[PDB]
């Protein structure tokens, strides 16, 4: 739309995006992962019995 | 494990008189260790197992 | 060299994207992230000293 001359942000290089706008060479090679909660160790030993 | 490994690029429009010079300065900074410095000061903090 | 001298259209292979080469031959979108690494033999870690 012309409101921005550039996009200085974490924009991944997609085929759909690359068809309309152009991208520079990557400044950050990355990928997709999963974020999960750290498992705090805690015994389930209810009692000595 | 990583998937869809596509990095981050500076997006500009198709015309982009800065297209060639932007990507070279990204490549040059990669070989100059400039992005390695920015990796340390903004990303690589650790201080947690 | 065989793309600069118009001896072939493309140079597929394990070519690395460099600033110097990009000034003479224009590359494409990288399909493999690369860089520099250092190969050293195994060193082990044994066990913690306060088990
Ligand atoms: N992979 C490099 C050459 C091998 C090296 O790193 O020395 C290149 O495409 O030019």
Curated annotation (Swiss-Prot), chain A:
Binding site for glycine: 10, 12, 17
Compartments, as annotated in UniProt: Cell membrane; Postsynaptic cell membrane; Postsynaptic density membrane; Synaptic cell membrane
Record's comment on post-translational modification: NMDA is probably regulated by C-terminal phosphorylation of an isoform of GRIN1 by PKC. Its phosphorylated state is influenced by the formation of the NMDAR-PPP2CB complex and the NMDAR channel activity.
Family: Belongs to the glutamate-gated ion channel (TC 1.A.10.1) family. NR1/GRIN1 subfamily.
Domain notes: A hydrophobic region that gives rise to the prediction of a transmembrane span does not cross the membrane, but is part of a discontinuously helical region that dips into the membrane and is probably part of the pore and of the selectivity filter.
Record note on quaternary structure: Heterotetramer; the NMDAR subunits are modular and harbor tiered domains that function in concert to regulate opening and closing of the cation-selective ion channel pore. Forms heterotetrameric channels composed of two GluN1/zeta subunits (GRIN1), and two identical GluN2/epsilon subunits (GRIN2A, GRIN2B, GRIN2C or GRIN2D) or GluN3 subunits (GRIN3A or GRIN3B) (in vitro). Can also form heterotetrameric channels that contain at least two GluN1 subunits and at least two different GluN2 subunits (or a combination of one GluN2 and one GluN3 subunits) (in vitro).
Annotated disorder: Neurodevelopmental disorder with or without hyperkinetic movements and seizures, autosomal dominant: An autosomal dominant neurodevelopmental disorder characterized by severe intellectual disability and developmental delay, absent speech, muscular hypotonia, dyskinesia, and hyperkinetic movements. Cortical blindness, cerebral atrophy, and seizures are present in some patients. Neurodevelopmental disorder with or without hyperkinetic movements and seizures, autosomal recessive: An autosomal recessive neurodevelopmental disorder characterized by severe intellectual disability and psychomotor developmental delay, involuntary and stereotypic movements, spasticity, and inability to walk without support. Intractable seizures manifest in some patients.
Its job: Component of N-methyl-D-aspartate (NMDA) receptors (NMDARs) that function as heterotetrameric, ligand-gated cation channels with high calcium permeability and voltage-dependent block by Mg(2+). NMDARs participate in synaptic plasticity for learning and memory formation by contributing to the long-term potentiation (LTP). Channel activation requires binding of the neurotransmitter L-glutamate to the GluN2 subunit, glycine or D-serine binding to the GluN1 subunit, plus membrane depolarization to eliminate channel inhibition by Mg(2+).
UniProtKB/Swiss-Prot annotation, chain C:
Subcellular location: Cell membrane; Postsynaptic cell membrane; Cell projection, Dendrite; Late endosome
Tissue expression profile of the protein: Primarily found in the fronto-parieto-temporal cortex and hippocampus pyramidal cells, lower expression in the basal ganglia.
Annotated disorder: Intellectual developmental disorder, autosomal dominant 6, with or without seizures: A disorder characterized by significantly below average general intellectual functioning associated with impairments in adaptive behavior and manifested during the developmental period. MRD6 additional features may include seizures, hypotonia, abnormal movements, such as dystonia, and autistic features. Developmental and epileptic encephalopathy 27: A form of epileptic encephalopathy, a heterogeneous group of severe early-onset epilepsies characterized by refractory seizures, neurodevelopmental impairment, and poor prognosis. Development is normal prior to seizure onset, after which cognitive and motor delays become apparent.
Gene label: GRIN2B
Summary of subunit composition and partner proteins: Heterotetramer. Forms heterotetrameric channels composed of two GluN1/zeta subunits (GRIN1), and two identical GluN2/epsilon subunits (GRIN2A, GRIN2B, GRIN2C or GRIN2D) or GluN3 subunits (GRIN3A or GRIN3B) (in vitro). Can also form heterotetrameric channels that contain at least two GluN1 subunits and at least two different GluN2 subunits (or a combination of one GluN2 and one GluN3 subunits) (in vitro). In vivo, the subunit composition may depend on the expression levels of the different subunits. Found in a complex with GRIN1 and GRIN3B. Found in a complex with GRIN1, GRIN3A and PPP2CB.
Role played: Component of N-methyl-D-aspartate (NMDA) receptors (NMDARs) that function as heterotetrameric, ligand-gated cation channels with high calcium permeability and voltage-dependent block by Mg(2+). Participates in synaptic plasticity for learning and memory formation by contributing to the long-term depression (LTD) of hippocampus membrane currents. Channel activation requires binding of the neurotransmitter L-glutamate to the GluN2 subunit, glycine or D-serine binding to the GluN1 subunit, plus membrane depolarization to eliminate channel inhibition by Mg(2+).
Annotated phenotype, changing residue 42 to H: In DEE27; decreased protein abundance; decreased localization to the cell membrane; increased glutamate-gated calcium ion channel activity via an allosteric effect which is characterized by increased glutamate and glycine potency and increased open probability; the mutant channel is less sensitive to magnesium inhibition and has increased calcium permeability compared to wild-type
Binding site for L-glutamate: 16, 21
Positions annotated with a glycan in the UniProt record: 44
């Amino acid at each position: 739309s012309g409101q921005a001359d550039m996009i200085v942000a974490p924009l991944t290089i997609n085929n759909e995006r690359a068809q309309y706008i152009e991208f520079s060479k990557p400044f950050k090679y990355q990928g997709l992962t999963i974020l999960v909660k750290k498992e705090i160790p805690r015994s389930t030993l209810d009692s000595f019995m | 494990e990583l998937f869809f490994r596509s990095g981050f690029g500076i997006g500009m429009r198709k015309d982009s008189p800065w297209k060639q010079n932007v990507s070279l300065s990204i490549l040059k900074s990669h070989e100059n260790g400039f992005m390695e410095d920015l990796d340390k000061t903004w990303v690589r903090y650790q201080e947690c197992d | 060299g065989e793309v600069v001298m118009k001896r072939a259209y493309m140079a597929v292979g394990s070519l690395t994207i460099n600033e110097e080469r990009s000034e003479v031959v224009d590359f494409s979108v990288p399909f493999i992230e690369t860089g520099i690494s250092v190969m050293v033999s195994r060193s082990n870690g044994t066990v913690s000293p306060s088990a």
